[PDB]
């Protein structure tokens, strides 16, 4: 819990606790000369300095607008009497890289982003931070950096993309991904396929459903580290620019209070974040990212913590991918604060947690308009979509250190079938192409896709959509030490630990082993005896790492297990 | 030498070898929908995609102009028939962080930059790269990423800052750093001190002397990975913008030739780079960065390689800090190509190395105007400033795995003195404050500043300027496992390996040990017997790491020794 990462300030009530290190001593005249050179007056040197870290880049719709938002954040910082210094990190697009080896680089970019913002804040002695992520992994990456530094900070979510519309039909990135399967199946022509591709993503913003971006944005708001409505204002909405211009005012107040990320991110605000995930049907990736965020502030968060919140919180929101609505429809019925107000009224949330407004969650939500009368997106507690949360933690013989599944309650309580084992996604997809019926009734195992084996713990969508299009949805189960993206109508488990590369039982499974998934017992078991499994283990040798240089070899050297949130700095 | 880091392309003569992975298969319609959303037409999808990676940020003069350069690079990429996708990494300012704990974050940002550009190029499937660094570590960071990817790439140096001028007096960042010592000594008043600070850095650009930025920029041009004149055109010069607009034309040609970084960065172009360092009196940091660059392409480069080139190449350039002129004065006498033309004419360089112009170094230099008649910056081979290079590799008892020193030839051949040992820069500076005369005649050892002990292998300037201001310049020697920045008029050695944190002999030195530096034997020796040293070693226990989380704990876990270039991905 005693984190030692970044420099500590060189007194109370001082607003420039860190930048005074370089703006005040005569022995740092070199630093002051650079600062004059970038435009600071003598008066400016007395002011707090805010690092404004955006994740702009031009090759992704989620991120191409973030420089325009960064300009607005800087203008608000200046209007609040402080100095704004913009800088920008990298990010990668899951939508672009999905289905390719580029996806091996996606999860780790969260931790690269954390390292990047930490590096700049520490070296330049900035007093506070405003981050503008726009896309899946960007968000937890910025919060992790704020937790390590423990300097006042606010996350401004870039906002969600608007749905595409063409000829009385609604299209999104899900439409684009689905289009190829509908072409091969014969449902649509090549001409209809191309139309979907040209009208799926009309502008800037993150993916609209309850995928990782909106899950994490909502969760981070719920955790108190974004301003109210940050998660539900669309990316191109003029209110997003207004939020950007106001972050500086709110940050000034945080500096006056010295309200820091470790004052805001606590066991109870972490639970608030998890409640929001459960209630909205949020992504299983939130397990990885919330664990990493909790670790970044010196706290603990286990898989069991997620299971307890899941048991305690019903799934209430009729939102894609599980349901029919998108983040804009939440926005039109009162936004994320309206949802959280309802959950707080139900006693599911703790209102006493401090937030980046300088007030408590309860104080923020006191004044917010409630959910729109007659709305059908957020179900009553009396009529939930599921009595408990979607997220389910499975252990048992084959996942002794844990695993994560999204369970709707429609797949049944059990699946038993002979294992069909693949060393990588490629061999699985080839086998289901040549011989789809060989999959009927099996427990499909795609191993070697974990943090070290993948490497990079890639997300895989093609296995579930291939299973769906072969008519095998409820007829087989899918297990991996990596991650699955789309929903089957059957059992789909990821994050199996230990991963195959580490010699976990998943790497000892053989074709024909009878595997039994039991949701009530929360176990993925094998009919193979523990003694024969141990025999296989004694004979097992770890495969060679797939890379020997570069960022992914460093990831292999540094990354902890999926049950440990794949943190890299421990 | 067999590097496995990044994805390989999914045919010859194809110009979009990598982006075809996502622009051509119907199974990647999701990728194509994102690309349409960011503005690509169907015709645009057929074009090569260039990742344009700048290191812009607002808090440093070296980097604040790089977004404007990035816009020009993109416009040139489009004018050459390709698609330009801008993205931006982080960087840190050595001028701002020097003298503070922020400096522990500076060297590692080179390797963070390499990881960042590698990550984006791999995930987004870009065909080529144009990088726009502006500051010390940025430059080798971008080349390392290009070496790992081995996709056609060009480095555009951001260019050097113009000298500040006020009331018939020339000021630079060196003036600003010197100002405090001149205030404490009484040479100048507080009023004169403040004047230097306001007129030292008038605009955008890297430091003007032969510090790391200009050393590396020149070295990277000499290595063939920048266009001719990139290193010597000033940052605000309109020709820099013209260079930016032309990089796309040159990159198109590289894609047609499939001339890749591992075709350009070879043993012989690495030697060309080292020749340029020796001849210009370049920074000892170039030892670290050129080793890392050579490793990134699967090549070897040792400390002995530097000593052999140093022995073979005289110091010829009258350039700060060793001399009086700056990079702009090279620029006014024909620039870096004119210098390299002279060295090539002397037979010091290999002209057959391919470069990013698509032609050889000799072909580039055939047409360039020679050095301005009557110039006094570049000495003749008959009258060099030093018969061999400044860079000197020392081993011996106390640096068995090597060490690096800048030797002018003025300090003599020997120094012998009792050791005065400090565990960190702070205790050294306090001791020389309270008791300066206790330093007279000693060999000052500042240990625990290496890659893992510092951590971060920080650069330290205050020890040499404190020694200078106490009148002790030629009266003591300075040794460290970290790095020293400014020049003493005596012996100053850095990069001592193994570092103290790793239990190298430097961590076993005690106050009073007689240390003898012998330049001719190239040895740093101790009078203590090898048997007593081994006794000390058997009793020695490694100190606890100073951090336990964050980017610097990861650095500690990953970094190799200074003699190994402090690479992190092996
Ligand atoms: C960030 C780095 C490089 C550090 C090395 C060891 C210390 C230095 O002082 C200690 C620990 C610290 O608590 C402070 O007083 O500032 C924080 C900073 C770190
Ligand atoms: C399931 C399909 C159709 C997706 C559309 C684009 C994304 C949505 O969010 C992104 C990419 C994803 O990384 C997540 O957050 O889960 C994976 C899933 C796919
Ligand atoms: C970059 C990553 C994650 C890789 C994992 C193992 C391989 C895959 O194929 C091999 C090696 C490769 O030579 C290719 O044919 O493309 C390069 C890419 C890497
Ligand atoms: C020696 C003094 C006065 C310097 C002025 C600013 C810089 C120059 O270059 C930068 C910072 C440095 O990182 C290098 O490249 O060596 C260290 C040295 C100091
Ligand atoms: S790919 Fe960026 S939020 Fe979906
Ligand atoms: S600090 Fe950037 S080049 Fe000197
Ligand atoms: Mg994702
Ligand atoms: Mg430097």
mmCIF file of C-alpha atoms in Angstrom, chain B residues 167-280:
data_model
loop_
_atom_site.group_PDB
_atom_site.id
_atom_site.type_symbol
_atom_site.label_atom_id
_atom_site.label_comp_id
_atom_site.label_asym_id
_atom_site.label_seq_id
_atom_site.Cartn_x
_atom_site.Cartn_y
_atom_site.Cartn_z
ATOM 1 C CA UNK B 167 22.098 44.501 -25.828
ATOM 2 C CA UNK B 168 25.081 43.280 -27.889
ATOM 3 C CA UNK B 169 25.412 40.062 -25.876
ATOM 4 C CA UNK B 170 24.729 36.446 -26.887
ATOM 5 C CA UNK B 171 22.852 34.174 -24.449
ATOM 6 C CA UNK B 172 21.792 30.507 -24.658
ATOM 7 C CA UNK B 173 20.573 27.815 -22.224
ATOM 8 C CA UNK B 174 24.207 27.481 -21.102
ATOM 9 C CA UNK B 175 24.071 31.159 -20.055
ATOM 10 C CA UNK B 176 20.920 30.477 -18.019
ATOM 11 C CA UNK B 177 22.475 27.493 -16.233
ATOM 12 C CA UNK B 178 25.716 29.394 -15.529
ATOM 13 C CA UNK B 179 23.827 32.403 -14.178
ATOM 14 C CA UNK B 180 23.341 31.097 -10.614
ATOM 15 C CA UNK B 181 27.027 30.308 -10.069
ATOM 16 C CA UNK B 182 27.931 33.784 -11.335
ATOM 17 C CA UNK B 183 25.438 35.207 -8.815
ATOM 18 C CA UNK B 184 26.797 33.269 -5.824
ATOM 19 C CA UNK B 185 30.404 33.996 -6.863
ATOM 20 C CA UNK B 186 29.590 37.720 -7.062
ATOM 21 C CA UNK B 187 30.527 38.097 -10.750
ATOM 22 C CA UNK B 188 27.026 39.318 -11.660
ATOM 23 C CA UNK B 189 24.170 40.834 -9.683
ATOM 24 C CA UNK B 190 20.685 39.449 -9.194
ATOM 25 C CA UNK B 191 19.511 41.977 -11.804
ATOM 26 C CA UNK B 192 22.025 40.756 -14.402
ATOM 27 C CA UNK B 193 21.125 37.163 -13.472
ATOM 28 C CA UNK B 194 17.440 37.777 -14.219
ATOM 29 C CA UNK B 195 18.282 39.444 -17.558
ATOM 30 C CA UNK B 196 20.079 36.295 -18.724
ATOM 31 C CA UNK B 197 17.037 34.185 -17.800
ATOM 32 C CA UNK B 198 14.643 36.332 -19.880
ATOM 33 C CA UNK B 199 16.795 36.348 -23.063
ATOM 34 C CA UNK B 200 18.398 32.877 -23.064
ATOM 35 C CA UNK B 201 15.760 30.921 -25.042
ATOM 36 C CA UNK B 202 13.992 33.163 -27.593
ATOM 37 C CA UNK B 203 11.975 30.520 -29.445
ATOM 38 C CA UNK B 204 11.528 26.907 -30.492
ATOM 39 C CA UNK B 205 14.336 24.426 -31.063
ATOM 40 C CA UNK B 206 16.842 22.068 -29.481
ATOM 41 C CA UNK B 207 19.958 23.219 -27.605
ATOM 42 C CA UNK B 208 22.469 24.895 -29.908
ATOM 43 C CA UNK B 209 25.792 23.371 -28.878
ATOM 44 C CA UNK B 210 27.150 19.891 -29.544
ATOM 45 C CA UNK B 211 25.047 18.457 -26.728
ATOM 46 C CA UNK B 212 23.030 15.260 -27.165
ATOM 47 C CA UNK B 213 20.444 16.715 -29.553
ATOM 48 C CA UNK B 214 22.874 18.096 -32.162
ATOM 49 C CA UNK B 215 25.270 15.192 -31.654
ATOM 50 C CA UNK B 216 22.474 12.719 -32.303
ATOM 51 C CA UNK B 217 20.850 14.708 -35.118
ATOM 52 C CA UNK B 218 24.181 14.959 -36.937
ATOM 53 C CA UNK B 219 24.966 11.322 -36.191
ATOM 54 C CA UNK B 220 21.574 10.188 -37.527
ATOM 55 C CA UNK B 221 22.026 12.224 -40.718
ATOM 56 C CA UNK B 222 25.518 10.732 -41.057
ATOM 57 C CA UNK B 223 23.919 7.295 -40.598
ATOM 58 C CA UNK B 224 21.675 8.040 -43.583
ATOM 59 C CA UNK B 225 18.367 8.126 -41.679
ATOM 60 C CA UNK B 226 17.662 11.851 -42.138
ATOM 61 C CA UNK B 227 17.588 13.908 -45.321
ATOM 62 C CA UNK B 228 20.689 16.024 -46.051
ATOM 63 C CA UNK B 229 20.723 19.253 -43.968
ATOM 64 C CA UNK B 230 18.070 17.962 -41.516
ATOM 65 C CA UNK B 231 20.499 18.245 -38.622
ATOM 66 C CA UNK B 232 21.762 21.757 -39.423
ATOM 67 C CA UNK B 233 18.650 23.703 -40.518
ATOM 68 C CA UNK B 234 17.416 25.757 -37.512
ATOM 69 C CA UNK B 235 13.990 24.961 -36.077
ATOM 70 C CA UNK B 236 12.324 28.190 -37.138
ATOM 71 C CA UNK B 237 13.975 28.308 -40.579
ATOM 72 C CA UNK B 238 11.512 28.211 -43.507
ATOM 73 C CA UNK B 239 13.675 25.492 -45.077
ATOM 74 C CA UNK B 240 12.736 23.166 -42.196
ATOM 75 C CA UNK B 241 9.096 23.406 -43.287
ATOM 76 C CA UNK B 242 10.210 22.711 -46.881
ATOM 77 C CA UNK B 243 12.126 19.648 -45.674
ATOM 78 C CA UNK B 244 8.913 18.505 -43.942
ATOM 79 C CA UNK B 245 6.878 18.863 -47.145
ATOM 80 C CA UNK B 246 9.496 16.922 -49.103
ATOM 81 C CA UNK B 247 9.787 13.950 -46.733
ATOM 82 C CA UNK B 248 6.688 12.375 -48.276
ATOM 83 C CA UNK B 249 8.195 12.425 -51.779
ATOM 84 C CA UNK B 250 11.351 10.780 -50.477
ATOM 85 C CA UNK B 251 9.330 8.252 -48.489
ATOM 86 C CA UNK B 252 7.305 7.304 -51.568
ATOM 87 C CA UNK B 253 10.582 6.464 -53.315
ATOM 88 C CA UNK B 254 11.721 4.389 -50.312
ATOM 89 C CA UNK B 255 8.476 2.407 -50.498
ATOM 90 C CA UNK B 256 9.003 1.797 -54.235
ATOM 91 C CA UNK B 257 12.554 0.597 -53.543
ATOM 92 C CA UNK B 258 11.522 -1.141 -50.308
ATOM 93 C CA UNK B 259 14.633 0.464 -48.813
ATOM 94 C CA UNK B 260 14.154 -0.271 -45.104
ATOM 95 C CA UNK B 261 15.980 0.860 -41.922
ATOM 96 C CA UNK B 262 17.941 -2.398 -41.741
ATOM 97 C CA UNK B 263 19.078 -1.745 -45.336
ATOM 98 C CA UNK B 264 20.310 1.711 -44.271
ATOM 99 C CA UNK B 265 21.553 1.142 -40.694
ATOM 100 C CA UNK B 266 24.519 -1.211 -41.151
ATOM 101 C CA UNK B 267 27.957 -1.702 -39.521
ATOM 102 C CA UNK B 268 29.364 0.810 -41.950
ATOM 103 C CA UNK B 269 26.687 3.514 -41.588
ATOM 104 C CA UNK B 270 26.940 3.064 -37.811
ATOM 105 C CA UNK B 271 30.651 3.763 -38.206
ATOM 106 C CA UNK B 272 29.801 6.810 -40.350
ATOM 107 C CA UNK B 273 27.625 8.033 -37.480
ATOM 108 C CA UNK B 274 30.454 7.466 -34.987
ATOM 109 C CA UNK B 275 32.934 9.278 -37.240
ATOM 110 C CA UNK B 276 30.631 12.303 -37.179
ATOM 111 C CA UNK B 277 30.506 12.166 -33.366
ATOM 112 C CA UNK B 278 34.309 12.003 -33.057
ATOM 113 C CA UNK B 279 34.912 14.758 -35.611
ATOM 114 C CA UNK B 280 32.325 17.159 -34.142
#
